[PDB]
Coordinates of C-alpha atoms and ligand atoms in Angstrom, one line a residue:
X3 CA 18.6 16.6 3.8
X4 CA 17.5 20.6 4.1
X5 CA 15.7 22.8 5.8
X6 CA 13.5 25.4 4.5
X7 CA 14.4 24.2 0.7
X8 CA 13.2 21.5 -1.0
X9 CA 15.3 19.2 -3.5
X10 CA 12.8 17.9 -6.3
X11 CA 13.9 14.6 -8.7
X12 CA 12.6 14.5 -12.0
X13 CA 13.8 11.8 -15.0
X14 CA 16.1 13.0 -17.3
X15 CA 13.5 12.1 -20.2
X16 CA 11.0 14.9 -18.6
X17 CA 10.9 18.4 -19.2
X18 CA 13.2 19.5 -16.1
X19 CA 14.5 23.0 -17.1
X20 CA 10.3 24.3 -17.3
X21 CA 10.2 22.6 -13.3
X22 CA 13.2 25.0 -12.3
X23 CA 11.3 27.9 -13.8
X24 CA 8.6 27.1 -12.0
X25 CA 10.4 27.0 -8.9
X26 CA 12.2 30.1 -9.4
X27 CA 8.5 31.9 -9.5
X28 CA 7.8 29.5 -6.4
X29 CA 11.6 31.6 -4.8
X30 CA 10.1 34.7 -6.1
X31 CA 7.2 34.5 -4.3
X32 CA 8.3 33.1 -1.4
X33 CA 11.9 33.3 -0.9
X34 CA 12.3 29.1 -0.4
X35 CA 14.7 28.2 -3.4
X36 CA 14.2 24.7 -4.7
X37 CA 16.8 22.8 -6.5
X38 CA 15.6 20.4 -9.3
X39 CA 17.4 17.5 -10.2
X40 CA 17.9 14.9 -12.6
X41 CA 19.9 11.9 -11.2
X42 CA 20.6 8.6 -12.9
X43 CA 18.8 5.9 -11.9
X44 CA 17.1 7.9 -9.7
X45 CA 14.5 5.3 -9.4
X46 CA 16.9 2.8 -7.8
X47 CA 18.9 5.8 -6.0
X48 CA 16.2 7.4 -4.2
X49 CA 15.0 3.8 -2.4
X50 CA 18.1 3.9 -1.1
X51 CA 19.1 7.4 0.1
X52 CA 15.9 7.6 1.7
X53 CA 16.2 4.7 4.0
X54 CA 19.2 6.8 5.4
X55 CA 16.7 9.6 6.1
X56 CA 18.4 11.7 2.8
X57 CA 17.6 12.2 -0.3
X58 CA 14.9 14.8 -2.0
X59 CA 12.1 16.4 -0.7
X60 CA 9.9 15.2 -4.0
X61 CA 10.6 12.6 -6.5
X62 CA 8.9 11.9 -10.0
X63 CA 7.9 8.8 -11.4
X64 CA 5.1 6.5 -12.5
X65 CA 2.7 5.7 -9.7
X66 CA 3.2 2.0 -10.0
X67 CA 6.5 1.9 -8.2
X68 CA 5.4 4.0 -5.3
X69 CA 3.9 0.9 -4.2
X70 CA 6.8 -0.4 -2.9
X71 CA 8.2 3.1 -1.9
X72 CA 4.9 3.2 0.1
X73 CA 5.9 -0.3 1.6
X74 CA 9.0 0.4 2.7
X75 CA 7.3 4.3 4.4
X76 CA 9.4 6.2 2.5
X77 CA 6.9 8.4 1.2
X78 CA 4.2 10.5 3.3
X79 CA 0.4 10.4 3.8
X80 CA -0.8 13.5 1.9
X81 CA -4.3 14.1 2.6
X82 CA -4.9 17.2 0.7
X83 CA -8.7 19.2 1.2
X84 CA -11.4 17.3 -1.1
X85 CA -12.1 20.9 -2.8
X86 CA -8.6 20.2 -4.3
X87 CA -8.9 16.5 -5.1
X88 CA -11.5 17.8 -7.9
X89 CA -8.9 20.1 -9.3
X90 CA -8.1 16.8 -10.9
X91 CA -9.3 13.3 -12.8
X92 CA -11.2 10.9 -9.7
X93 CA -9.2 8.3 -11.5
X94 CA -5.9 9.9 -11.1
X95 CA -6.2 9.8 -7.1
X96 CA -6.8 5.9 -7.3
X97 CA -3.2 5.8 -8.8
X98 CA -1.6 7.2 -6.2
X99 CA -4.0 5.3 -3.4
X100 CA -1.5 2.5 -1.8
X101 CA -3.4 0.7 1.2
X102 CA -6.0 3.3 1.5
X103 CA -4.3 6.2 1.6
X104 CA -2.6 8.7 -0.7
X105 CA 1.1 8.7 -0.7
X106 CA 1.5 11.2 -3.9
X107 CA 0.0 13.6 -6.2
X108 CA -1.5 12.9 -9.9
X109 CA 0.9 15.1 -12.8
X110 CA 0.7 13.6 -16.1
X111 CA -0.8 10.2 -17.8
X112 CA 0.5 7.6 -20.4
X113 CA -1.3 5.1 -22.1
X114 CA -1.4 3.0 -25.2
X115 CA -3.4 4.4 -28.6
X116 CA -4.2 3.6 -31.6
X117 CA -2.2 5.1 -34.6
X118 CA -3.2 5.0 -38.0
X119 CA -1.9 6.2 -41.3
X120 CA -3.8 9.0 -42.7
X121 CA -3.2 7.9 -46.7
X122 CA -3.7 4.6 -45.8
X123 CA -6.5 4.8 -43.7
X124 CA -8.9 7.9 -44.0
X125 CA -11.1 6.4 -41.5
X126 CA -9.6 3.7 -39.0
X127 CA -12.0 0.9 -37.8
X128 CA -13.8 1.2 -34.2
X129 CA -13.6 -2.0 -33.9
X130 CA -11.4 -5.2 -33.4
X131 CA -13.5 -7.3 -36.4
X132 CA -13.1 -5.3 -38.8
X133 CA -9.4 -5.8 -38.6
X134 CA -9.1 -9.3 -40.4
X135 CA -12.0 -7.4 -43.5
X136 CA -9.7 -4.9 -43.6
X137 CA -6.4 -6.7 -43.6
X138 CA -7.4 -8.5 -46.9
X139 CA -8.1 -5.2 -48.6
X140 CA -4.7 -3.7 -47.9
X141 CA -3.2 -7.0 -48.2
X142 CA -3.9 -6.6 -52.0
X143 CA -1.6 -3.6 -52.2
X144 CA 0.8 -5.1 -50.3
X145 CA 0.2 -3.6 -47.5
X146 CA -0.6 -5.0 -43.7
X147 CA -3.5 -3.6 -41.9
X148 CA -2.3 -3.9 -38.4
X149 CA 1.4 -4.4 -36.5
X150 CA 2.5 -4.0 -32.9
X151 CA 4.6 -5.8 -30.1
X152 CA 3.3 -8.9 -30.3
X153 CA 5.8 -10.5 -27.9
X154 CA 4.9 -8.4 -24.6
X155 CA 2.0 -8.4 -22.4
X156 CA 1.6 -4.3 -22.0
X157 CA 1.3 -4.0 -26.1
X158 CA -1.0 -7.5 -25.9
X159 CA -3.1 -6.9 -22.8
X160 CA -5.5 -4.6 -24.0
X161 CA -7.3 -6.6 -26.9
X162 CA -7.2 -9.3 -23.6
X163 CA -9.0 -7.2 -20.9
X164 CA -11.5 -5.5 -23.4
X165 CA -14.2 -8.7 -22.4
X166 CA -13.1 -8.5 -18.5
X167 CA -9.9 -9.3 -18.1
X168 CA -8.2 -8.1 -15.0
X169 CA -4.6 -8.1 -13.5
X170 CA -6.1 -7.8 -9.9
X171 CA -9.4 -6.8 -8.8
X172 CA -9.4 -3.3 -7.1
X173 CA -11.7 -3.8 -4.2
X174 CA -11.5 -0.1 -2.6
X175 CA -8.3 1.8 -2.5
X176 CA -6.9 -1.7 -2.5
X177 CA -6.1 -4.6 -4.7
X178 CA -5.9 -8.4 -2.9
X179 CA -3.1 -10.8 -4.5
X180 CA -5.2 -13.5 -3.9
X181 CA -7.7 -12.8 -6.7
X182 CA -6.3 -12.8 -10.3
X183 CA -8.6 -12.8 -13.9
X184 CA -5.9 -13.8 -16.1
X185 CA -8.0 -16.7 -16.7
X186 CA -11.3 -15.5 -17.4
X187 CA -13.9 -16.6 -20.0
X188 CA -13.2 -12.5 -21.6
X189 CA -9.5 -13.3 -21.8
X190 CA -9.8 -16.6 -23.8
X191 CA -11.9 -14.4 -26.0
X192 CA -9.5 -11.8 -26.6
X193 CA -6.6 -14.0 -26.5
X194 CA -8.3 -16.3 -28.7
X195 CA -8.9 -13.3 -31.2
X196 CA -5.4 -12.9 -31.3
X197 CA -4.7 -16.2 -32.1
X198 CA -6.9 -16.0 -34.9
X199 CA -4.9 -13.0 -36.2
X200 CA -2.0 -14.5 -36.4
X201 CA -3.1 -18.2 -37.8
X202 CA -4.1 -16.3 -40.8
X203 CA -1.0 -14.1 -41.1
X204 CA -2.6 -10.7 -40.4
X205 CA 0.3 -10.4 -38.5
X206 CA 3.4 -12.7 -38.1
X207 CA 3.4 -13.4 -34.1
X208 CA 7.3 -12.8 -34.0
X209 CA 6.8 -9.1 -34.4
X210 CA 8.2 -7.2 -32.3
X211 CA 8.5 -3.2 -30.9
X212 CA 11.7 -2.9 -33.6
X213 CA 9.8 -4.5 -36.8
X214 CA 6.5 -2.5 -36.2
X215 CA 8.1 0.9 -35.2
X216 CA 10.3 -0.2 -38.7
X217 CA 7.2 -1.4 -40.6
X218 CA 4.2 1.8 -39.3
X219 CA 7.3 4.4 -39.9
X220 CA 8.6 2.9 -43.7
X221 CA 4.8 3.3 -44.8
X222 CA 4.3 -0.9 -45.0
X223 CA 1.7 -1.3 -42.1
X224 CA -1.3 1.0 -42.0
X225 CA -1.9 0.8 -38.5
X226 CA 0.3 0.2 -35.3
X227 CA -0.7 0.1 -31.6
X228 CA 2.1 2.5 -29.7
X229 CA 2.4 5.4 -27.1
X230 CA 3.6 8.9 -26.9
X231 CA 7.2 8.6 -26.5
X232 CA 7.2 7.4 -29.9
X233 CA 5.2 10.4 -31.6
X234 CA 8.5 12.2 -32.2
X235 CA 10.1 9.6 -34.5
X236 CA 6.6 9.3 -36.6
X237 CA 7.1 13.4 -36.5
X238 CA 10.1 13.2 -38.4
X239 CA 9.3 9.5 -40.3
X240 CA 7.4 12.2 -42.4
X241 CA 4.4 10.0 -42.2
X242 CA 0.8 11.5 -42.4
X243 CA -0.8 9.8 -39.3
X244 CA -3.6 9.9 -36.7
X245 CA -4.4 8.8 -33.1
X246 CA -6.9 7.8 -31.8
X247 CA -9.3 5.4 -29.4
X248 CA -8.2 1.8 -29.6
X249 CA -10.8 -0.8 -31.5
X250 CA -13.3 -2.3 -29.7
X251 CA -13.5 -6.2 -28.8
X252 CA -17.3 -7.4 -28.6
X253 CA -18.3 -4.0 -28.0
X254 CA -16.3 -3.5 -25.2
X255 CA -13.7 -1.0 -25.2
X256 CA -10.1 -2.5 -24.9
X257 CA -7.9 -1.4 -21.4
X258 CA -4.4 -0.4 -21.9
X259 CA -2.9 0.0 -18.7
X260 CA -2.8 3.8 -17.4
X261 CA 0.5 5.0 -16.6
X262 CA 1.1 8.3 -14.3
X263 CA 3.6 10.8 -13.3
X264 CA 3.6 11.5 -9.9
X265 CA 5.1 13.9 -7.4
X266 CA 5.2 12.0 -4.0
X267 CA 7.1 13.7 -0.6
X268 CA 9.6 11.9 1.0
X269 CA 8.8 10.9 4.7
X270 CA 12.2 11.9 6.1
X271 CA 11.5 15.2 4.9
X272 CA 10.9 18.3 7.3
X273 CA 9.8 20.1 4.3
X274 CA 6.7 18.4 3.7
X275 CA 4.3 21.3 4.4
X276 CA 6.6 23.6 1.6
X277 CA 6.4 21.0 -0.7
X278 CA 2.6 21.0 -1.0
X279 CA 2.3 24.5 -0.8
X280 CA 4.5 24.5 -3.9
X281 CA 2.7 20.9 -5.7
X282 CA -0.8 22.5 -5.2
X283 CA -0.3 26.2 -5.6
X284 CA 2.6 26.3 -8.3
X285 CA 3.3 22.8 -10.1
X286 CA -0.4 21.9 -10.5
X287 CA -1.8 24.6 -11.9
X288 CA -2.5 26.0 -15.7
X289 CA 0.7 28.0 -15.3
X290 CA 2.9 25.8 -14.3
X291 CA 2.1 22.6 -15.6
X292 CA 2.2 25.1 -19.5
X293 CA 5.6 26.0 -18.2
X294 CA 6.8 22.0 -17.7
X295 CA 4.9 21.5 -21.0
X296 CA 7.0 23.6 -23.1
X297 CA 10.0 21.8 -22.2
X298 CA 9.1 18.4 -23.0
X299 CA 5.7 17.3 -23.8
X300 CA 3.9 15.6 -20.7
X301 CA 1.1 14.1 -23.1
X302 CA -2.2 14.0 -21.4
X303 CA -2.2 15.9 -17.5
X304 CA -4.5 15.5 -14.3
X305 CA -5.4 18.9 -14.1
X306 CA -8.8 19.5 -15.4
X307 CA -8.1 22.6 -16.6
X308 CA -5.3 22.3 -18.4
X309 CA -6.3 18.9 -19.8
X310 CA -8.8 20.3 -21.2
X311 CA -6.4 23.2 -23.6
X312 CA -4.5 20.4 -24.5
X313 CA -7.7 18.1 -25.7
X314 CA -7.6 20.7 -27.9
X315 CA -5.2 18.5 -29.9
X316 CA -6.9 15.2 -30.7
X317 CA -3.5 13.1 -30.1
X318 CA -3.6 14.0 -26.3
X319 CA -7.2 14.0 -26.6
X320 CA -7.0 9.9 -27.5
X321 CA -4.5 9.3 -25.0
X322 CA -6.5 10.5 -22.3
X323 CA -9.7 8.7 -23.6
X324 CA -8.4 5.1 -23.8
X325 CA -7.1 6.0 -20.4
X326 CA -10.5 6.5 -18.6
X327 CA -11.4 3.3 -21.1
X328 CA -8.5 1.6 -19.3
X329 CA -7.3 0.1 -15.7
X330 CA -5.0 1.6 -13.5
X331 CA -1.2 -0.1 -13.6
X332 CA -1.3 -1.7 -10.1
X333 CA 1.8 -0.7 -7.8
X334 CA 1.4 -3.9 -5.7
X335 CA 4.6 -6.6 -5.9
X336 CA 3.0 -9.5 -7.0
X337 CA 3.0 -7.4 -10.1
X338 CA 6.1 -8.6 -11.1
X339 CA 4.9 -12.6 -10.6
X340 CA 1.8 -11.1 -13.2
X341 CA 4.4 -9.7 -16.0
X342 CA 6.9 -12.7 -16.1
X343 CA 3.4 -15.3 -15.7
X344 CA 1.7 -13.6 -18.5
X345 CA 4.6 -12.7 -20.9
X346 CA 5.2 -16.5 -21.6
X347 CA 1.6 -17.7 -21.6
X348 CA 0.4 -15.8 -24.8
X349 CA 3.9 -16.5 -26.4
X350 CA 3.0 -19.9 -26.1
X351 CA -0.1 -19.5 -27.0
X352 CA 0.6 -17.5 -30.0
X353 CA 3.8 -19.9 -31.5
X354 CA 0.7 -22.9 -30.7
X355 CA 3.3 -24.5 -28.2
X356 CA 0.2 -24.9 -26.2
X357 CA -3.2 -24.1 -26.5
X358 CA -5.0 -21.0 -24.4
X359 CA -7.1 -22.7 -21.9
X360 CA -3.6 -24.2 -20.8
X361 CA -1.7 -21.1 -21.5
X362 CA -4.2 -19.2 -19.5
X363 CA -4.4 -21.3 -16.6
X364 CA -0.7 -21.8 -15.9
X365 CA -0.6 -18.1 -16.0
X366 CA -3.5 -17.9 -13.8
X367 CA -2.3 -20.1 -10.9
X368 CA 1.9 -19.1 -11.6
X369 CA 0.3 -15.2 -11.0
X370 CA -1.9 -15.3 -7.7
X371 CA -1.2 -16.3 -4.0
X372 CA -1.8 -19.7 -2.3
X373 CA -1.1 -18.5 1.4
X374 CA -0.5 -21.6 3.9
X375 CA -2.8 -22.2 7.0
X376 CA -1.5 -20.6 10.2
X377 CA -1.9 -23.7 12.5
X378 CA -0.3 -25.8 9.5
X379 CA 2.5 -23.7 9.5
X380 CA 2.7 -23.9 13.4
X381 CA 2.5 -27.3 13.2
X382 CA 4.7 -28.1 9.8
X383 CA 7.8 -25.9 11.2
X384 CA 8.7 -26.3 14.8
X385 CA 12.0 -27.0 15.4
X386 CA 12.0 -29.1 19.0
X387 CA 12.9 -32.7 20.2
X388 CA 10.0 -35.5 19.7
X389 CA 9.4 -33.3 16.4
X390 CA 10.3 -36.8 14.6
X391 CA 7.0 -37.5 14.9
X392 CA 5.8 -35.5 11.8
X393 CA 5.8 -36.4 8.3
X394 CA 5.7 -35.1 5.3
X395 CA 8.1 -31.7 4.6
X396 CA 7.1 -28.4 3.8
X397 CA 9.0 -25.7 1.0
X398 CA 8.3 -22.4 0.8
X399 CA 10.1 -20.4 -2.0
X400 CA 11.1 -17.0 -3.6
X401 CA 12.3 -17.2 -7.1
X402 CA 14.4 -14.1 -7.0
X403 CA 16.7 -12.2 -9.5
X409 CA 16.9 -8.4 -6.1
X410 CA 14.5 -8.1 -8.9
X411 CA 11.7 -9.6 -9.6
X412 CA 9.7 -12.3 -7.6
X413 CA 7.4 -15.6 -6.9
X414 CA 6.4 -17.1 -4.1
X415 CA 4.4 -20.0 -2.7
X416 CA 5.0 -23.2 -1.2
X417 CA 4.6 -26.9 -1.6
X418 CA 4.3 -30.0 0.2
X419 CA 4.7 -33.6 -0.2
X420 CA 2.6 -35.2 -2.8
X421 CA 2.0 -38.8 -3.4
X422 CA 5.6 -39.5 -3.4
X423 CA 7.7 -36.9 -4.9
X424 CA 9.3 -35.5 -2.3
X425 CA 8.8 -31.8 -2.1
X426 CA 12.7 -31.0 -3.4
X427 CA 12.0 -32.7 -6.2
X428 CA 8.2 -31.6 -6.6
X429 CA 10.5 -28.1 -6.9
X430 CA 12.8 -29.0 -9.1
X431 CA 9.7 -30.1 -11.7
X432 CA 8.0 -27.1 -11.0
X433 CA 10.7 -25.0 -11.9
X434 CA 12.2 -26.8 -14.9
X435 CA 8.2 -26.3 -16.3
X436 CA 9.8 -22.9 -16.0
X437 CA 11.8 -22.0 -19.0
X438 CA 14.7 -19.8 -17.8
X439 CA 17.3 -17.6 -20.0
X440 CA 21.0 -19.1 -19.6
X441 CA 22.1 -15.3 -19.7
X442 CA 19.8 -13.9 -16.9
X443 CA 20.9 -14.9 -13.5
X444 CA 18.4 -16.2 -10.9
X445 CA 18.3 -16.0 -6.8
X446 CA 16.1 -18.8 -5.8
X447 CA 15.5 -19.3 -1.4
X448 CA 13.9 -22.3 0.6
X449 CA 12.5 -22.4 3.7
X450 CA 11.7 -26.2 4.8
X451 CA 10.1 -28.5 7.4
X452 CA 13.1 -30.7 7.2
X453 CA 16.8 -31.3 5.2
X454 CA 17.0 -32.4 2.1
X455 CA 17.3 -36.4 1.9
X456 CA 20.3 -38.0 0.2
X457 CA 18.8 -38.7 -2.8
X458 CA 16.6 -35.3 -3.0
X459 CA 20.4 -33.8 -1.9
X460 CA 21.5 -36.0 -4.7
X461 CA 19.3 -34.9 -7.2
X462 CA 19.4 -30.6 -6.2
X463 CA 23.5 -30.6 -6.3
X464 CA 23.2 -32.5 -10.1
X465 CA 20.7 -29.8 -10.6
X466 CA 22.5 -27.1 -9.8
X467 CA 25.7 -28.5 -11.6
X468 CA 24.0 -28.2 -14.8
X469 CA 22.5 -24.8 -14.2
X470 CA 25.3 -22.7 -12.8
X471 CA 23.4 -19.7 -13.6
X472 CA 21.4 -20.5 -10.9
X473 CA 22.1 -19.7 -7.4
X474 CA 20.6 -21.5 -4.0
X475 CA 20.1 -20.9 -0.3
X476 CA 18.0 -23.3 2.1
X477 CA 17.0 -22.4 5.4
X478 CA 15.5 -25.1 7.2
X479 CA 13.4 -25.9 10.8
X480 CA 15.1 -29.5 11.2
X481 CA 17.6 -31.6 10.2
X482 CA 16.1 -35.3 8.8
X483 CA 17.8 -38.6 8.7
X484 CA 16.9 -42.4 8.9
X488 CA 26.5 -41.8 7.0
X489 CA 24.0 -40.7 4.6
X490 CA 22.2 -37.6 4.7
X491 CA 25.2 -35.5 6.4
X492 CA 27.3 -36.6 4.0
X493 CA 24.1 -35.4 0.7
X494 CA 24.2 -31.8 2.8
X495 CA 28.1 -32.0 2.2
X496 CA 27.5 -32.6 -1.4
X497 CA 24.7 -29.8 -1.5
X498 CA 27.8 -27.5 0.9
X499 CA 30.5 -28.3 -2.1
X500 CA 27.8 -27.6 -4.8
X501 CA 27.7 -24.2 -3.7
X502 CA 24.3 -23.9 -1.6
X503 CA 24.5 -22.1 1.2
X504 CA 22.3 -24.0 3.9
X505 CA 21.2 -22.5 7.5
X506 CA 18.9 -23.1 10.1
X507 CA 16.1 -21.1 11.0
X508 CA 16.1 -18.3 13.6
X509 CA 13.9 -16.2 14.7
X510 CA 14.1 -13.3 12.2
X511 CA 13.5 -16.3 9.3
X512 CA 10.4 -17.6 11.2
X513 CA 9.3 -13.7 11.6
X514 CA 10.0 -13.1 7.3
X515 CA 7.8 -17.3 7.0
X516 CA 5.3 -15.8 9.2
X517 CA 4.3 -12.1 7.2
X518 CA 5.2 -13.5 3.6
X519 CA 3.8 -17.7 2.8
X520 CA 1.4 -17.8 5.8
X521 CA -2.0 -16.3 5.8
X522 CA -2.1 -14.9 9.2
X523 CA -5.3 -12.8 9.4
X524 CA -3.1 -9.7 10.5
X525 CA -2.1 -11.3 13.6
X526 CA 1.5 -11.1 15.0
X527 CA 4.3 -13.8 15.2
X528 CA 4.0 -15.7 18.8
X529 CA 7.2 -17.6 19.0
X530 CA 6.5 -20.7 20.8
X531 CA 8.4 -22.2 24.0
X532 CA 12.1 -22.9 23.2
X533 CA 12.4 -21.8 19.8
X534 CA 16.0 -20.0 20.3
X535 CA 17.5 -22.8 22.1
X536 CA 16.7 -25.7 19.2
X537 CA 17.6 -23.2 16.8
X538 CA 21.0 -22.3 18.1
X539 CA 21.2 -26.2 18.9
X540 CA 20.7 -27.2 15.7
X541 CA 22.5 -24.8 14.2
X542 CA 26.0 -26.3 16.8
X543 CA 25.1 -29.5 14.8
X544 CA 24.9 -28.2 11.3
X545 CA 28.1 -26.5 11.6
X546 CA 29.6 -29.8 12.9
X547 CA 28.4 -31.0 10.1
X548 CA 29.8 -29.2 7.3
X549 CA 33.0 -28.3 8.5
Ligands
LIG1 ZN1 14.2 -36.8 -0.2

């Protein structure tokens, strides 16, 4: 990494070349070149090369993945004078607030939109119940009224979270896991709604982005539900079209979920006083962000001022509006467990493969955190002599991919021993044979013979799947050796807990209050004993 120059990373996809002429003013004026680059997959690159204490001084992207940037302190505390914060959208701040505190700087924002065709439709409906009145007019010309990605939750969500639907409630410059409003009497409605739309055949429920970009751009479909990077195609479709502010459910406005570019500084840089001198005096101004403009279009900005020349086309004008009508994408993890929860639930309950009360709340309790108790955890996974004694064993997981996640944990119903518990929780789960999954245990005790049994068969038959067990205390009552040999052959790789894997149990499944790990007396000693046995054991 430099000194007295700054390295800036920008997407490929965004208007790069405008940047660099912005910082060649920037090396005009002050003499500090700045390179601008556009890596590939800079977005996975950059979480590594910054770890190192490398990488750029500034790095582009949507505001949701600076969450875990944030996590892992890669990115600096900015706190820039409140006479600036105004320069821009209140809103836009929240974006970039991770824990309380601003790790980047707002640039540009995407968001969903209504787009209707002009011939079609000279004046598009405000709101969502005029849709199936409408449908049946056009549907007499052979026509539909209304077609989007019915398959994903980021097209769907909206017409969902217009009657209160929420993904996590923001409590103040912070979002808590534990609360979730996926299931929510304003959710049912809009779900519902859908539903309705698609038992009639206004739309088909197998569209997808493909068949309505196909449909909207052919002329067949009146009205499609879309965002800016697909203007340009419509552009050239030589279709006469509008946008404008999504349809209204009960009166409510519908919530896409707002999207926004933004410049955040890398923590290992020493640069990081030059590099917002050069966001706030250069990048974010009228000048500069018309410069970046003119390269590739950034649709709707931050900046006041600017934002306000280009409301001046009513496109940009839309986008920003169902942005302030919509809800901040959440940079949080448990964001992924909310995509993968949700995506499934309303294809389920738009085939009819369930109904959306149970669609709903399976996606409401698979998407939010049950946290253990502390002293249950203390109690549940000591490894120590005369630790017989307790009974029934404890699992947390991580359904990995590293990609996306779930966590939790379980514990012995009435019977069903907690392996097994597992094993029906996740077969529930629908999985795709092509995708490959990292799934990790942390238990009370081993696995019994016939849980062993049971997991290696498992296993067997889903060799896309991949499993690791670490575990407090080996259980017995010949046998159970022998099932952890089984579950050895099968390909699992099984440990014993140390310290480090009772640290990760501690700050991930375990509600904790904020207090620290206190490792009780003689926790090394089992561990490494235990761990003489296992290996005598398996080999
Ligand atoms: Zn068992």
């Amino acid at each position: 990494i430099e000194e007295g120059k700054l390295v800036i990373w920008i997407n490929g996809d965004k208007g790069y070349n405008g940047l660099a002429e912005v910082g060649k003013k920037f090396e005009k004026d002050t003499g500090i070149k700045v390179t601008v680059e556009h890596p590939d997959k800079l977005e996975e690159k950059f979480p590594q090369v910054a770890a190192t204490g490398d990488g750029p001084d500034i790095i582009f992207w949507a505001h949701d993945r600076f969450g875990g940037y944030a996590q892992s302190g890669l990115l600096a505390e900015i706190t820039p004078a409140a006479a600036f914060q105004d320069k821009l959208y209140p809103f836009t701040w929240d974006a970039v607030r991770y824990n309380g505190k601003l790790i980047a700087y707002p640039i540009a924002v995407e968001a969903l939109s209504l787009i209707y065709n002009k011939d079609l439709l000279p004046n598009p409906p405000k709101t969502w119940e005029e849709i199936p009145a409408l449908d049946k007019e056009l549907k007499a010309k052979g026509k539909s009224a209304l077609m989007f990605n019915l398959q994903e939750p980021y097209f769907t969500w909206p017409l969902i979270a217009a009657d209160g639907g929420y993904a996590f409630k923001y409590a103040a410059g912070k979002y808590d896991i534990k609360d979730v409003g996926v299931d929510n009497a304003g959710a049912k409605a809009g779900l519902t709604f859908l539903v309705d739309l698609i038992k009639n055949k206004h739309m088909n429920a197998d569209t997808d982005y493909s068949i309505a970009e196909a449909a909207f751009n052919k002329g067949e479909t009146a009205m499609t539900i879309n965002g800016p990077w697909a203007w340009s195609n419509i552009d050239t479709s030589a279709v006469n079209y509008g946008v404008t502010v999504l349809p209204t459910f009960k009166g409510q406005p519908s919530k896409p979920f707002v999207g926004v570019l933004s410049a955040g500084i890398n923590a290992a840089s020493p640069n990081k006083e030059l590099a917002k001198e050069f966001l706030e005096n250069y990048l974010l101004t009228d000048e500069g962000l018309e410069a970046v403009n003119k390269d590739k279009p950034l649709g709707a900005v931050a900046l006041k001022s600017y934002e306000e020349e280009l409301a001046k086309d009513p496109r940009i004008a839309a986008t920003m509006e169902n942005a302030q009508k919509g809800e901040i994408m959440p940079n949080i993890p448990q964001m992924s467990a909310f995509w993968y929860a949700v995506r499934t639930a309303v294809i389920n309950a738009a085939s009819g493969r369930q109904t959306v009360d149970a669609a709903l709340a399976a996606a409401q309790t698979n998407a939010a955190a049950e946290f253990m108790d502390p002293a249950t955890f203390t109690y549940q996974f000591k490894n120590v002599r005369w630790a017989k004694g307790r009974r029934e064993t404890y699992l947390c997981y991580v359904v990995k991919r590293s990609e996306s996640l779930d966590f939790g944990y379980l514990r012995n119903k009435n019977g069903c021993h907690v392996e097994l518990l597992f094993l029906r929780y996740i077969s529930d789960w629908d999985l795709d044979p092509g995708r490959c999954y990292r799934v990790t245990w942390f238990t009370s005790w081993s696995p019994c013979y016939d849980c062993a049994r049971h997991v290696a068969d498992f296993l067997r038959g889903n060799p896309n799947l991949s499993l690791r067990i670490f575990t407090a205390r080996l259980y017995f009552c010949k046998a159970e050796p022998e099932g952890l040999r089984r579950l050895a052959e099968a390909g699992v790789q099984i440990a014993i807990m140390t310290y480090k894997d009772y640290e990760y149990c501690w700050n991930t499944f375990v509600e904790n209050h904020e207090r620290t790990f206190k490792a009780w007396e003689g926790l090394h000693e089992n561990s490494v004993r235990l761990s003489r046995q296992l290996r005598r054991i398996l080999q």
